[PDB]
Every structure is written in structure tokens, then in C-alpha cells.
Design a protein around this nucleic acid. Structure first.
Ligand SMILES: [Mg+2]
Ligand SMILES: [Mg+2]
Ligand SMILES: [Mg+2]
Ligand SMILES: [Mg+2]
Ligand SMILES: [Mg+2]
Ligand SMILES: [Mg+2]
Ligand SMILES: [Mg+2]
Ligand SMILES: [Mg+2]
Ligand SMILES: [Mg+2]
Ligand SMILES: [Mg+2]
Ligand SMILES: [Mg+2]
Ligand SMILES: [Mg+2]
Ligand SMILES: [Mg+2]
Ligand SMILES: [Mg+2]
Ligand SMILES: [Mg+2]
Ligand SMILES: [Mg+2]
Ligand SMILES: [Mg+2]
Ligand SMILES: [Mg+2]
Ligand SMILES: [Mg+2]
Ligand SMILES: [Mg+2]
Ligand SMILES: [Mg+2]
Ligand SMILES: [Mg+2]
Ligand SMILES: [Mg+2]
Ligand SMILES: [Mg+2]
Lengths: 50, 118, 203, 78, 124, 132, 49
RNA sequence: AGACCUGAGUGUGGCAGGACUACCCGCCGAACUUAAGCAUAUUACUCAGCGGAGGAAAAGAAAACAACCGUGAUUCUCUCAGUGAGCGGCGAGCGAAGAGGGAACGAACUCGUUGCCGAAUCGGGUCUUACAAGGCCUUGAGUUGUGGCACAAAUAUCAU
């Protein structure tokens, strides 16, 4: 709630950044296979627990 | 016959030569620069980071995470030749360590953001 | 020569003189640790024949091994399945004490290449083998071709694999003829050899 | 009872993050990683799960020094 | 534009460390710009100016590794150099046997190489 | 049903099949054509390396042992100290000029060494041994 | 090894000479002592010089 | 009031652990299954378990086979041989070896003993183009034996 180690804090911060959409300069690339991010977590759906 | 006034035998205090102070475990060069440019990495421009330059005399730099409130002051003075009184820090929910920095009330903060180009 | 006389004292190992020497020396051995570094070997005759020279880089250890048959480790002394395995105390460990002695010294002292070992003493409780070990990186060992071979890296834990003479004993080697038709080169090399299902291309 | 009600009593943590295995199997009370046996020098590794060995072998990660040293020893140097 | 290494090798340590602290400050304020405006002309100098600090720390390390090698790779007494400068090669290539042995033989093994050498005979 | 079949005795009851659970214990020779090429490639490449020496050494005639084979002659390894002594050559020096030496054969019948003593001096005739 | 019943073969070494002639026995052994790696290497050197 | 012996302490110089494990080596080691039941047996000297190396490992130079007109390290292969061997509730099942044709193979060697030597050894230096298959200083190890040489009542050993 208020106690999280800094290491456990560094690992949720690395997840708050991974939870951004694919930028719309990626899907005009020549031959990419990416249309969606397909690794977006939602805090309710699935939990990280770390 | 040596005088032992103890129930135990504690190890005798023999001579203890010091180590040799090996030369170094590295070659890689260092400087005065990298010690002060790694700490203060870039200032911050937000609705709150701007409201604190004018109203207060603070600045906002996104310092590196493993820095030190005493070494943000040294770094300021080494980079921006201004004094720092209170350096409040916080590791944001991005793993990035922000830093608020009072400029001694003698270096106007609004004269550095205009110098530093914030 | 000098060897002929030490070698014959130890062959008369049950006399009252040699058994006095062993009755006092089996007594300090019982108040020393399991593994003990020695300066000289107790049996120079039997050590120097097993490949021990008194150069640098050669070290000798007494290792103590508890005597008697190994007891199968089954919870509560309870064994399950076929009564083939019903016994718990009468198994014998298929690896002689001298190999176990040599392998105790290997797990502990990983920087040494165990070479051989020999019998030094046994009471009715313990049994001490002096294991002849070599420091594979003392420059003496390095530049001496009689024992260079052990610096090579295939000999790192020859003790752990039964490559020492004590290991070569319980591996059924040391019989060559019809006496080891399934022992050669190993229990499984022969086993793989006899139980592979070979398929020629043209059958 | 022993279903949705008892699922409410799920307060603690049995396991936290393993400093060596990097996963969530570090049993707190008796401090050992349930998946790499940390602080045991040897990582746990059992042939009865080859599939889990494969999730944990070399090459499954970055493999920094080897992608380099395997290049030096395959070019006559070491 | 930036530092060109072919003309940068000839520089000295004290001359590099002033060359360095100036590319740091130049990039220090390019990450100020990168915050507020986009300014691809004012911006965009990062990737050349950040790989010029790279090829200065390179030549700095390329040099003070040699100076500390033409000082430790010496016939000096007890010649133990730091293990970071000792010719690196795999843990076992470092233990195995150098060339000066693995070819070394006793007496009564040299002397058969002479008495009874191997011959280059041919059969007719 | 069964009936008037030979009692099978097939001996395939020891997990030889490399199934999903067992690693298998079968030796299939799908590489023997590669190996025949592999060996003849080493052989023909070892022969031009040992050149001008003969690739194979000289081996004597020996009598195959049992009553089934005693009339069949065969090439055994090494000659003996005896043939070499009865032909001059030091078995230390015979073992370095292509002659193969066997310190274990016993020359039980003079008949035996006579075929081989003379078999040496054929070689020792048609051998150049040009010095270094 | 003072308590036990020391056999008559190992006892032999606990009935040594006395200090009377022991120093004399060490006098001979001392003056007829070998050459000390320095008068050995310069002795066989005069065997070439 | 010192040597030696047995132990310490840190100073230097190193090493070991860990990963990988298909193959390989040691130990450990089942059971399901088969026997139309099942306890011997079989599965299997297998799986799992512990340990340990290598590019291969292991084995290897006869305390071997044979009984012949003899063969001659190990390994591998075809074969002997699913065996008129044999083991086996002699049931289910199991089950090799010599020989033979091959592959490979310039494959052999060195300690200890023995005799003759007895520090010629080893290590720290140093000197030399790094030369440590050497020079020349070294008690520092070592005589509780490092090293050298010879191979049999038959040879020739042994020194200039
Ligand atoms: Mg120093
Ligand atoms: Mg101790
Ligand atoms: Mg000890
Ligand atoms: Mg001790
Ligand atoms: Mg003792
Ligand atoms: Mg010592
Ligand atoms: Mg071997
Ligand atoms: Mg065979
Ligand atoms: Mg706790
Ligand atoms: Mg621990
Ligand atoms: Mg493990
Ligand atoms: Mg002692
Ligand atoms: Mg001492
Ligand atoms: Mg140390
Ligand atoms: Mg450990
Ligand atoms: Mg290991
Ligand atoms: Mg059944
Ligand atoms: Mg079985
Ligand atoms: Mg297993
Ligand atoms: Mg080998
Ligand atoms: Mg068949
Ligand atoms: Mg069986
Ligand atoms: Mg044959
Ligand atoms: Mg000797």
C-alpha cells in the first residue's frame, strides 16, 4: 500500500512504461508484423504481484 | 613455563603484516566531467515544474536514480554555477529520480531556466 | 635396499610390534579430523610406489572412513515395492571404503588432483586411508613429465569417476579375461554394446 | 466454507521475487527460491522435468559472454 | 560538426578531457531542448554528438590501456600484472599446459628420439 | 489363434524403442556410406601425408588358432623379437622403419619364424631408407 | 606409549646412548659431514678448471 | 636461554565452487509391466536421485586367449548367436565369450622395486635477445630420497 521495496518499485515502473500503445509511426514501416500491442496489461484483468 | 592465567588457550597475538595495496583492477579513464554530467541529466518542464521556478526559486531536474541529495548540490554548482539549499528528491513511478532545487534565494531560478533554456 | 625392509614389516602387519605401532597410531587418528593434511606420508614405501615423489606440489592426507556396511536410506527404515529390496541394513554399497575415502578428499579439496591412496590403519570403528594428492598448478608439477599428465583437464575428478586404483577395483577392472566380459570397458559400455538394437541399412 | 468464502482469507505472501531466478518463487518463511533453490550455489535442476530444464538452459537468455567467447574460440583465439 | 577519430588519435589525454567536457555540455543542453521543443535542427544533433563522446572515451581507454600495458608488460621483477590486462583466454586455455610443457620429456626419453628416430623410408 | 508356429523368442522387451518417454537404445547405420567416404578420405589423405612411406606397416603371417582355422594363415600384429634377431634388425630399430614389432609372440614352431624371417629380408631388400 | 607394554623391538630406541659419548659421536659425524652445495659445486668446478 | 617436530596467524602466488549433460564415468536406484494370479524372476543392473569430466569419455600394453600348425594392448564393427553354451517358479523370459573377416594402428610407454650412482633434482633469484633440455649465485624445499643409468647364468655393462 505504502511499503514497496525500491526494487519492487523499479519493477512496476518498468511495467507502467511497457503499457503504452504502439506509436503510429510503426505500422507504416515496410514489413512489420505489428498492428496492436498485444502485451497491454490492465490492472484489473491481470495482476503482476511483483 | 609461560604464564597462562586463563581456562582457555586464546590464539597468540602474532605479527600481522599489512596487504600490498594492489595497483588497480581497471584501466578505464575517468574525469571531472562524467562525475557531474551523469547525475543531473536534464531539467523538467511541466505545469508544476514551471510554477515552481517563478513562484518559488526551485528547479526540476530528472536526476539519475542512484544519485544523492548532497551530490545534486555539488553537481548544480559544478554545472550551473548557482548555490542549492534544499534538494528534495523523489523516485517517480517511472524509475526516474526527480529533483527540486532551491537556488539559495540569491540566484534567481527564472534567470537559469532562461539560461539553461528551459 | 631401504625399501625391502619397510615393505616386509608391513607384510607382517599382525605381529605384536607392528600392531603396537598401529594401536597407538590408530589412537591419535581417532582424535584428529576426518581429513587431515600430513607433511610426510606414514608409509613412504607404499606412498612412493603409488606415484608419490617428495617434490613440491605433492600433498598427503589421512581421510577417516566409518567401517561396516552401508544402510539403505529409507524413511523410518521402511522400503516399498518388491521384497528384493526389503533389506535395509545388509546392503554393501558396491564401492569400497578406499574409493569413498578418495572421494571425500575430492569434494572437499577441489584444487587437488587425487592420485592414489593406501591403507594406513583400521580400528573396529574407523579406517584411515592416506590419499596421495597433487597440486596440478605448482610449477614443479607443471614442468615434470612423469606427472604432467594429471594437469590435463580430463583428470579433474578421476576419484569421482572410479579412475583411481581403488575405483578400478570396485569397477570389476583388474580382471581382464573371461572374468570381465561384461565389465569392459564399463558396466554400461558393455551394456549398451549388448543391448543396442542394431539396424543395418540392407537387412 | 471452503470456496469463495475461504478465498477471502488470502492475505499473506508465500513467495516473493527471487534475486537469482528473477521469478516469484522465493519462499519467504524458509528463505529459499522454490524454482532455483537460491541461496543454494547450485540451481535446482531435475531430469523429471526436462521441459522446465529447457525453460532455464543457456541461450534461453541473453548469453552475453558466450556469444562473444564462442566467436573468439572459433577464430583461433581464446 | 563532431570529432573525427582519424584526427583525434593524435590528441593527448589533457587535450581530450577538455574535448570531452565540451561534448558533454553540448549534449547536456541538447537534452534540455529535447524536453521542451522538437526543433529537429536544434535537435537531431544528439546521435552524432553522443557517438562523439563514444569515440573520445574510446581513444582515452585505447590509450591509458596501452600506457598501463607498456608499464606492466615489462621484464620487471615479480612481473604480476593486473588480471584485466593479462592476455584473456578461456579458463581452461589458461590452466591447461603452456607450450613450454606438454612437449617436455625426461631423460631416457630424449635419448631414444636420437638412437632410434623415426625414418622417412620408402618401399620399392 | 496360435498353432504350429515357431516359439518366437524375439527378445525385444527392454525399452529399445525411442518412444516419447524412453530415450531409445537403437543403432541405425544411416551413416555408413558417409563413413566409408569419410575413412577413405582420411586414408587417402593420410597416405599422401606419410608418403613416401607405405600407409600400412608390415605384418607377418600367423596361423589362425583353433582346429577350425589352423590351416588358414593370417596377418598378425608385429613379428617377434625372434624373427628380428634372426634377421639382424633391432626390434627398437625395426619398429621405426615400418616393420611392426610384437614382443609377445613366442615363435613356437621354427616353421613359423622361417616364413617370417625370410619375409623380413624381402622388405629389407626392397626398402630404400634414405637418410635425413 | 609410556603406559603400554612396549615390545622388545620398539623399546630399543628408548635406551639411547648417554651424553657422555653422544657429543663425541656427533663430533665425528660433524667434521666428516658432506659438502654444503657450495663446496660441492666449486669442488667439481676445479674438476674442469 | 635455540634447533627440530607438530601446529597456527596474514603477506604474497594461485586454485576450487557455478553453468552445460545429448553422449560419457562412478554410486544410487525403483515401480508400472510380463509371468494371463504373484513373492523368485522379468521390467532393469533401466527411470528418477547424487556426483564428474571431455571433445569424445571410458578402456588400454596381458597375473589375456586358447589347447591350435597356436593367437598377442584397448576400442569398434560384421560375425560367432537369440546360441544343441548357458542362467531361469528350468516358467515367463534371459543370454554372453574365444575364434573369423574388418576399421584403426610408423603404439607404445614410466614410476616403485633391483643394482650402480647420491642432490647431478626442485624452487627463488640473476645473467644472458625470454634461451627455464645452460649459464651462476642461492638452505629455500629436499637425504623420511629429488634425480641419473642399466634390464635375466644372460649379456655385453661401464668410463676416458
Ligand atoms: Mg607491487
Ligand atoms: Mg586445519
Ligand atoms: Mg589438514
Ligand atoms: Mg594440520
Ligand atoms: Mg602421523
Ligand atoms: Mg611441503
Ligand atoms: Mg586410463
Ligand atoms: Mg567384446
Ligand atoms: Mg522470515
Ligand atoms: Mg549459501
Ligand atoms: Mg544442481
Ligand atoms: Mg604428524
Ligand atoms: Mg613451521
Ligand atoms: Mg591471499
Ligand atoms: Mg560451496
Ligand atoms: Mg562443477
Ligand atoms: Mg502379471
Ligand atoms: Mg537387473
Ligand atoms: Mg538418470
Ligand atoms: Mg582417456
Ligand atoms: Mg544375429
Ligand atoms: Mg538382465
Ligand atoms: Mg581378427
Ligand atoms: Mg627415484
Amino acid at each position: 500500500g505504502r511499503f514497496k521495496p525500491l526494487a519492487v518499485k523499479k519493477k512496476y515502473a518498468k511495467k507502467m512504461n511497457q503499457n503504452k500503445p504502439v506509436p503510429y509511426w510503426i505500422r507504416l514501416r515496410t514489413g512489420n508484423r505489428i498492428k496492436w500491442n498485444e502485451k497491454r496489461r490492465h490492472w484489473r484483468r491481470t495482476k503482476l504481484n511483483y | 613455563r609461560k604464564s597462562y592465567t586463563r581456562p582457555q588457550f586464546r590464539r597468540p597475538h602474532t605479527y600481522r603484516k599489512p596487504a600490498m595495496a594492489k595497483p588497480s583492477n581497471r584501466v578505464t579513464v575517468e574525469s571531472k566531467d562524467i562525475a557531474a554530467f551523469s547525475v543531473i541529466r536534464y531539467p523538467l518542464t511541466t505545469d508544476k515544474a514551471m510554477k515552481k521556478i517563478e513562484e518559488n526559486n526551485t528547479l526540476t531536474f530528472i536526476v539519475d536514480s542512484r544519485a544523492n541529495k548532497t551530490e545534486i548540490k555539488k553537481a548544480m554548482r559544478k554545472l550551473y554555477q548557482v548555490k542549492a539549499v534544499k534538494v528534495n528528491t523523489l523516485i517517480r513511478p517511472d524509475g526516474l529520480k526527480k529533483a527540486y532545487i532551491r537556488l539559495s534565494a540569491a540566484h534567481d531560478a527564472l534567470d537559469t531556466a532562461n539560461k539553461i533554456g528551459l | 635396499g631401504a625399501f625391502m625392509y619397510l615393505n616386509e614389516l608391513w607384510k607382517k602387519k599382525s605381529s605384536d610390534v607392528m600392531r603396537f605401532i598401529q594401536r597407538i597410531r590408530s589412537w591419535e587418528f581417532r582424535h584428529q579430523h576426518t581429513v587431515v593434511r600430513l607433511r610426510r606420508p606414514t608409509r613412504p614405501e607404499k606412498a612412493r610406489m603409488l606415484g608419490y615423489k617428495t617434490k613440491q606440489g605433492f600433498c598427503v592426507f589421512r581421510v577417516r572412513v566409518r567401517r561396516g556396511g552401508r544402510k539403505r536410506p529409507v524413511h523410518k527404515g521402511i522400503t516399498y515395492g518388491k521384497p528384493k529390496t526389503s533389506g535395509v541394513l545388509g546392503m554393501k554399497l558396491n564401492k569400497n571404503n578406499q574409493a569413498v575415502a578418495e572421494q571425500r578428499l575430492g569434494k572437499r579439496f577441489g584444487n587437488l588432483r587425487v592420485l592414489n591412496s593406501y591403507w594406513v590403519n583400521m580400528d573396529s570403528t574407523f579406517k584411515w586411508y592416506e590419499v596421495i594428492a597433487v597440486d596440478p598448478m605448482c610449477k614443479t608439477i607443471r614442468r615434470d613429465p612423469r606427472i604432467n599428465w594429471i594437469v590435463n583437464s580430463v583428470h579433474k575428478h578421476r576419484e569421482q569417476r572410479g579412475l583411481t586404483s581403488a575405483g578400478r577395483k570396485h569397477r570389476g577392472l583388474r580382471h581382464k579375461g573371461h572374468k570381465a566380459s561384461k565389465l569392459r570397458p564399463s558396466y554400461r559400455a558393455a551394456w549398451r554394446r549388448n543391448n543396442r538394437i542394431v539396424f543395418l541399412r540392407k537387412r | 466454507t471452503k470456496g469463495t468464502t475461504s478465498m477471502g482469507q488470502r492475505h499473506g505472501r508465500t513467495h516473493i521475487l527471487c534475486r537469482r531466478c528473477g521469478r516469484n518463487s522465493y519462499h519467504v518463511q524458509w528463505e529459499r527460491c522454490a524454482a532455483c533453490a537460491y541461496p543454494r550455489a547450485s540451481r535446482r535442476r531435475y531430469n523429471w522435468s526436462v521441459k522446465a530444464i529447457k525453460r532455464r538452459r543457456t541461450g534461453t537468455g541473453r548469453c552475453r559472454y558466450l556469444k562473444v567467447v564462442n566467436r573468439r574460440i572459433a577464430n583461433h583465439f581464446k | 560538426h563532431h570529432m573525427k577519430i582519424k584526427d583525434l588519435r593524435e590528441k593527448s589525454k589533457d587535450d581530450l578531457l577538455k574535448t570531452l567536457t565540451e561534448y558533454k555540455k553540448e549534449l547536456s543542453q541538447l537534452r534540455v531542448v529535447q524536453q521542451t521543443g522538437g526543433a529537429e535542427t536544434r535537435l537531431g544533433r544528439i546521435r552524432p554528438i553522443r557517438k562523439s563522446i563514444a569515440r573520445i572515451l574510446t581513444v582515452l581507454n585505447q590509450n591509458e590501456r596501452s600506457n598501463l600495458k607498456m608499464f606492466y608488460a615489462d621484464r620487471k621483477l615479480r612481473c604480476k600484472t593486473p588480471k584485466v590486462l593479462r592476455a584473456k583466454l578461456t579458463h581452461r586455455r589458461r590452466l591447461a599446459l603452456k607450450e613450454n610443457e606438454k612437449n617436455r620429456k625426461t631423460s631416457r626419453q630424449m635419448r631414444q628420439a636420437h638412437k632410434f628416430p623415426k625414418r622417412v623410408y620408402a618401399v620399392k | 489363434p496360435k498353432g504350429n508356429n515357431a516359439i518366437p523368442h524375439v527378445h525385444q522387451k527392454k525399452h529399445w524403442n525411442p518412444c516419447s518417454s524412453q530415450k531409445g537404445n537403437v543403432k541405425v547405420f544411416l551413416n555408413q556410406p558417409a563413413q566409408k567416404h569419410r575413412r577413405r578420405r582420411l586414408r587417402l589423405l593420410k597416405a599422401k601425408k606419410v608418403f613416401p612411406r607405405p600407409l600400412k606397416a608390415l605384418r607377418p603371417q600367423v596361423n589362425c588358432p583353433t582346429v577350425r582355422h589352423n590351416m588358414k594363415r593370417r596377418l598378425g600384429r608385429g613379428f617377434s623379437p625372434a624373427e628380428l634377431k634372426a634377421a639382424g634388425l633391432n626390434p627398437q630399430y625395426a619398429a621405426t622403419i615400418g616393420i611392426r614389432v610384437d614382443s609377445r609372440r613366442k615363435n613356437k614352431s621354427e616353421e613359423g619364424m622361417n616364413v617370417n624371417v625370410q619375409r623380413l629380408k624381402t622388405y629389407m631388400s626392397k626398402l630404400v631408407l634414405f637418410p635425413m | 606409549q609410556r603406559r603400554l607394554k612396549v615390545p622388545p623391538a620398539l623399546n630399543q630406541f628408548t635406551k639411547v646412548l648417554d651424553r657422555a659419548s653422544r657429543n663425541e659421536a656427533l663430533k665425528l659425524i660433524k667434521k666428516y659431514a658432506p659438502e654444503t652445495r657450495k663446496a660441492r659445486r666449486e669442488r667439481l668446478h676445479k674438476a674442469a678448471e
